[PDB]
Design a protein around this ligand. Sequence first.
Ligand SMILES: CC(C)CCC[C@H](CCCC(C)(C)O)[C@H]1CC[C@H]2[C@@H]3CC=C4C[C@@H](O)CC[C@]4(C)[C@H]3CC[C@]12C
Ligand SMILES: CC(C)CCC[C@H](CCCC(C)(C)O)[C@H]1CC[C@H]2[C@@H]3CC=C4C[C@@H](O)CC[C@]4(C)[C@H]3CC[C@]12C
Lengths: 15, 221, 233
Amino acid sequence: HVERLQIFQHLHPIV
Amino acid sequence: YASLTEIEHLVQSVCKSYRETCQLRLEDLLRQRSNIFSREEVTGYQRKSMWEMWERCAHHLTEAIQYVVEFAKRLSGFMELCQNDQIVLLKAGAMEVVLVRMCRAYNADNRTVFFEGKYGGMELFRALGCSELISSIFDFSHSLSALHFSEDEIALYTALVLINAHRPGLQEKRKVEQLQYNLELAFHHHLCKTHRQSILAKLPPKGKLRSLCSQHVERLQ
Amino acid sequence: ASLTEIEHLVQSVCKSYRETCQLRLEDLLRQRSNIFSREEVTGYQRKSMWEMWERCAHHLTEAIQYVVEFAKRLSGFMELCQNDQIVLLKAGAMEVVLVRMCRAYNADNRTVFFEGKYGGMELFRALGCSELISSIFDFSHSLSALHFSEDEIALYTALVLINAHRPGLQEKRKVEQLQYNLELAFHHHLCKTHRQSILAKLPPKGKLRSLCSQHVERLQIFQHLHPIVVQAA
Ligand SMILES: CC(C)CCC[C@H](CCCC(C)(C)O)[C@H]1CC[C@H]2[C@@H]3CC=C4C[C@@H](O)CC[C@]4(C)[C@H]3CC[C@]12C
Ligand SMILES: CC(C)CCC[C@H](CCCC(C)(C)O)[C@H]1CC[C@H]2[C@@H]3CC=C4C[C@@H](O)CC[C@]4(C)[C@H]3CC[C@]12C
C-alpha cells in the first residue's frame, strides 16, 4: 500500500 | 447500466482514459528497443550508491503512480465514490497497476526494461541489493509479455485491478461492486468483440499481483 | 512542560521550515534587482488565461508539496491518524502558501518573485481577476511590514496548520495538545527574540481563511475545465 497521504497528494495536488 | 451499448461506451471511455495517461506511448517504447545501455553505462549504474539508486527509483515510481492516479480519476464512476474509497482503492491497487504497466516497457527478446531513456537488464539495479525482488518482477513482466497485451486490454485489466470491492476499508462497498461488475462485463464483452477471450485463462492468478507488490511495499523511505 | 522541551520544539519546527522553505531567503533577496522588463510583462499578459492557469497551478502545486513536507516534519504531526492529517492539510495548506508568499514579495516596488524574476501584479492580467490578485499582493505587503524572520514564519505557519478547530477531526484532543505546545513554542520564542510586538499585528485567523476561500472558488472551476499533473520531490 501507498501511504494514505501520498495517495491524497496524487488525488488532489492543489485541494 | 442495463444495456450493451452503455457497456461499449464504458469500454471506449476506459480506453481513452488509459491512452491519455499511459505515460509512455507504446509506439515510442517499441522504436526505443534498439536503444540499450552499453557495458560502461550499466557499470556506471552499478557503482552508484543504493541510496542514489533508490532516490532515482523512488522518483520514477512516484511519477508512475501519479499517472495511475490520473487514470483512476478518469474512470467513469471512480470520482463518484466517496473520498475514503478512492483513497482505499488507490493505496491498495496503484502499485499493482504500475507492475502491470511495466510489461509495456519490457522487451522479452533480451529481458531488458526501459529505464531512464534506454533499455537495460536487471543487473542495472545491482546496487539496490534486491536481486530476488528485481528478478521476481522481470519474470512476471516476462509472463505478461507472452499474452501480447493490447493497450485496450491493459486499460480494461488495470481498471479491474483498481476497482476491486474486496479492498478492506471501503465505506460504500456496494457502489464499488456496481463499478466492478460493469467493468468486468466490459472486459469480457470487449474480449469477445476482438476474439481474445483466450487471455482470460492466461492472466496472472489470484493474489499474484498482491503477493508481488506486498513483497515490495516493505521499504524504509 | 519544561522550557527545555519548548525550546527544543522551537529548534525543531525551525529546522523543519529551513529544510522545506522551497526558496532560500538569501536567494529571494539577491534576486530583487532581477525584474521583468516591460516586454517580458507584455509577453505574460499576451498569454491565454489557460496557459497562465497551467503555469500558476504548476507553481502552486509545487508550493503545496513543500508545505505538506513541512507538516510531515512537525513534531507529532505524523503521529496523528491519516484522516486528521488530511483534514489539517486541506484546511490549512493554502493559508500557509499565502503566508510563505511574503518572503518572495518585494514591498519596495510591489513585485513578487514569479518564474525566475520579480514582477508586479500586472503580470497576471490574463487571468482576469485583478481583485483577487490585488488582495494577496496587499496582504503580502502588510506582512512584509512586519519583517517576519524565517523562524517567525516557521512557528506561525505551524499554528496555521495545527488547528484543533478544523471540522472533521477525529482526535481533536490530540490536535489540541499539538496546537498548545506549538503556541508555547511560538510565544516563548517571541520573548527570547524580543518580538512579542508582532502578536497583535498578525492577521486574525479569519483573514487568511477568507482570502483563501476567495481563490479556491476560482481554482476549482479552473481545475475541472482542464487539470494538471506535476512531479514531486
Ligand atoms: C512492485 C513494483 C512496481 C516496484 C517497483 C520496482 C522498481 C524498483 C524497486 C526498488 C525497491 C527498493 C522498491 O526494491 C521500479 C523502479 C523504477 C520503476 C519504473 C519507472 C517507470 C515506469 C514507466 C511506466 O509506464 C511502467 C512502469 C515503469 C517501467 C516502472 C517499473 C517499476 C520500476 C522499475
Ligand atoms: C496563496 C493563494 C491563496 C493564492 C494563489 C495566487 C497565485 C495564482 C492566483 C490565480 C487564481 C486564478 C487562483 O486567482 C499563485 C500562482 C503561483 C503562486 C506562487 C508560486 C510559488 C511561490 C513560492 C512559495 O515559496 C511562496 C508562494 C509563491 C510565491 C506562490 C504565491 C501564490 C502564487 C502567485
